[PDB]
Design a protein around this ligand. Structure first.
Ligand SMILES: CC(=O)N[C@H]1[C@H]([C@H](O)[C@H](O)CO)O[C@@](O)(C(=O)O)C[C@@H]1O
Length: 655
């Protein structure tokens, strides 16, 4: 594989460079590969990295280019005027803009393969898109190609889509190179910011909902949603994966599955991004989603998660049943047996399944992972697989029958639950899950967790876990170091998806920062360790779309400008989930916050959705975030889009 042309350190501010002499008559087949290492000096406007065109008047629509948008989209066009053929292939959120005050160096590539009739695009080690098109065009197919340009496209004798930046290195090949060669050629520093990668140990092509936490030992812990049937919240097959770093985030463990069902296996699916397929979903699969981490005072770690039985969306879960039944003062999980209409059974002591009608134990029992036994032996069901030719079918593998499955003999109430697991070794191993009792009441479903961390209120030792119902905040708490759980339900002014996080301002004084349906971040204050809550106030410097986004806010252990500090991450834009910012807030003696500093994470039109902050052992700050707009139907089912970055406080002061 030898380049037909190579150029280096080409600095441009809109005007481009003519390379026609060097490239006219190099592309005999018509196929091509172009690999471009670049950085942008200005991201505004549509910019072409190179352009091969018919430059004569009348032939404005006869060209091939690779382009970048101010939102980080990478794409290509291949067009021919006289035949009115117009190919466009792209993927949102493909490149980085700026990082810590400097333009980021990216490496992207295009492959045009006339035998396969495909265009492929690569960015920073990932094949971001591959598309077979019917009206395929290569360089020879376009009539009268006479101009070859770096950093623009010559249309009707004028430069269009002028690039602003430096082409550090650009290589043209007169053939289609193979996938692994180009992935490798595009690998760079950007590629190293992934902790979870598509089709890693987890078997998932997709991830959403990152969480970071630092343990007392100096381990930095991460969890994430491993979402297997694309990035849909529901319906989907979702596991919680984890990974950790014992060296201040420089290196991470291979990801482990920590909360998982096996009614479907953990295997990679190629989820359609086209408008006609992207609404496809994995239907019948039990799920964990939305993790919350806290470390207790005794150094045991807790992790909570939402639990969804197979076929239960957030929208279709019954809201008028907890899934639990009260018998002689105790709460017990109800079960319906196949062929019954009513819920005649309960799980009591030792997981023994009781017939409530007779008040006698049956021969069935439920294990600590919700698996169903009969006379002490496991019942089985066939595992499902997914295939695209979409079809879901039984694959011949037997797994334990489970109360959360579609094919179970005994089934839970089709509603959402909360489960928690604990670790005595800083997240190397975990207990079996405990389903949370019906803290909201017997005739109400469980709340939904606000992903991220919980806190320990220093003065009382109260454990606080943020959650919400749709209409209320539900602050789940324990006053006996996690042996028992209660909830403070707080009515909100409207139907907020009130994903929240807590900070402590001073002893006894806490604030819950949350998403709303009004465009603002709300904060509620408690001066009695969470027992009662003030009316909401709103941050005046963040302005988001009405749907909102999850946020992250943490306490920071070191003084900044002599003051106690908190650190907030959120998008900040009414155009979408964009324009990520980190804000440093300094607490005053009266417990108001001086929001003194902010730092923009990349350019304002680049994507920034859910995020998580942690303080590193060395007092740097770790950030992981969805670097795309996770609301947009245009940015679903994207691979390798949740990076991790470390900041110094001095970095966060700038902007
Ligand atoms: C990559 C891309 O989007 N290209 C499109 C451009 C841009 O929208 C520019 O803003 C306007 O030149 O608009 C066209 O009408 C054009 O100029 O022929 C169609 C073309 O497909």
């Amino acid at each position: 594989n030898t380049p037909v042309l190579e150029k280096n350190n080409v600095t441009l501010t809109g005007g481009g460079e003519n390379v026609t002499k060097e490239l006219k008559d190099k592309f005999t087949s018509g196929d091509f590969t172009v690999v471009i290492k670049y950085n942008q000096s200005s991201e505004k406007g549509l910019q072409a990295l190179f352009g091969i065109s018919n430059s004569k008047p009348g032939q404005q629509n006869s060209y091939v280019d690779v382009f970048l948008r101010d939102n980080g989209e990478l794409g290509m066009e291949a067009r021919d005027t006289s035949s009115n053929k117009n190919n466009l292939v792209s993927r949102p959120a493909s490149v980085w803009g700026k990082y810590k005050q400097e333009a980021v160096t990216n490496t992207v590539a295009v492959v045009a393969d006339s035998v396969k009739k495909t265009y492929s695009l690569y960015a920073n080690g990932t094949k971001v898109v591959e598309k077979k098109v019917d009206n395929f065009l290569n360089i020879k197919d376009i009539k009268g190609i006479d101009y070859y340009m770096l950093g623009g496209v010559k249309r009707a004798g004028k430069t269009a889509f002028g690039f602003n930046g430096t082409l550090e290195n650009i290589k043209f090949f007169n053939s289609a190179l193979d996938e692994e060669t180009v992935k490798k050629m595009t690998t760079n520093a950007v590629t190293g910011h992934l902790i979870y990668t598509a089709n890693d140990t987890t078997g998932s092509n997709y991830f959403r909902i990152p969480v970071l936490y630092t343990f007392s030992n100096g381990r930095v812990f991460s969890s994430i949603d491993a979402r297997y049937g694309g990035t849909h919240d529901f319906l989907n097959k979702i596991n919680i994966a984890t990974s950790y770093s014992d060296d201040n985030g420089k290196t991470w463990t291979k990801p482990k599955l920590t909360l998982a069902f096996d009614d479907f296996a953990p295997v990679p699916l190629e989820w359609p991004r086209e408008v006609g397929g992207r609404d496809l979903q994995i239907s019948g699969g039990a799920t964990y989603i939305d993790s919350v981490i806290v470390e207790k005072k005794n150094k045991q770690v807790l992790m909570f998660a939402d639990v969804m039985p197979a076929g239960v969306s957030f929208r279709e879960a019954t809201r008028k049943d907890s899934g639990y039944k009260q018998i002689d003062g105790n709460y017990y999980l109800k079960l319906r047996k196949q062929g019954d209409t009513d819920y005649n059974y309960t799980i009591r002591e030792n997981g023994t399944v009781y017939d409530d009608r007779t008040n006698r134990p049956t021969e069935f029992s439920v294990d600590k992972n919700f698996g169903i036994k009969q006379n002490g032996n496991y019942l089985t069901v066939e595992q499902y697989s997914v295939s695209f030719e979409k079809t879901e079918y039984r694959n011949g593998t037997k797994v334990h029958m489970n109360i959360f499955y579609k094919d179970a003999l005994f089934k839970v109430v089709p509603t959402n639950y909360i489960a928690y697991i604990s670790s005595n070794d800083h997240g190397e191993s975990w207990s079996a899950p405990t389903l949370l009792p019906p803290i909201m009441g017997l005739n109400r479903n469980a709340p939904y967790l606000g992903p991220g961390r919980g806190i320990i209120e220093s003065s009382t030792g109260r454990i606080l876990i943020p959650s919400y119902t749709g209409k209320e905040s539900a602050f789940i708490y324990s006053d006996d170091n996690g042996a028992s759980w209660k909830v403070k339900v707080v009515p909100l002014p409207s139907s907020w998806s009130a994903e929240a996080q807590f900070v402590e301002l001073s002893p006894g004084v806490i604030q819950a920062y949350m998403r709303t349906n009004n465009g603002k971040i709300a904060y509620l204050t408690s001066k009695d360790a969470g027992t009662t809550w003030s009316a909401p106030e709103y941050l005046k410097f963040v302005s988001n779309p009405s749907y909102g986004t999850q946020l992250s806010i943490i306490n920071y252990s070191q003084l900044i400008d002599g003051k106690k500090a908190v650190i907030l991450s959120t998008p900040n834009s009414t155009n979408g989930r964009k324009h990520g910012q980190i804000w440093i807030g300094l607490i005053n003696d009266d417990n108001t916050i001086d929001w003194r500093y902010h730092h923009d994470v990349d350019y304002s039109n680049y994507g920034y959705s859910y995020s998580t902050l942690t303080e590193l052992p060395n007092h740097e700050i770790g950030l992981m975030f969805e670097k795309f707009d996770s609301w947009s139907r245009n940015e679903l089912h994207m691979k390798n889009v949740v990076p991790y970055i470390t900041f110094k406080i001095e970095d966060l002061k700038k902007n």
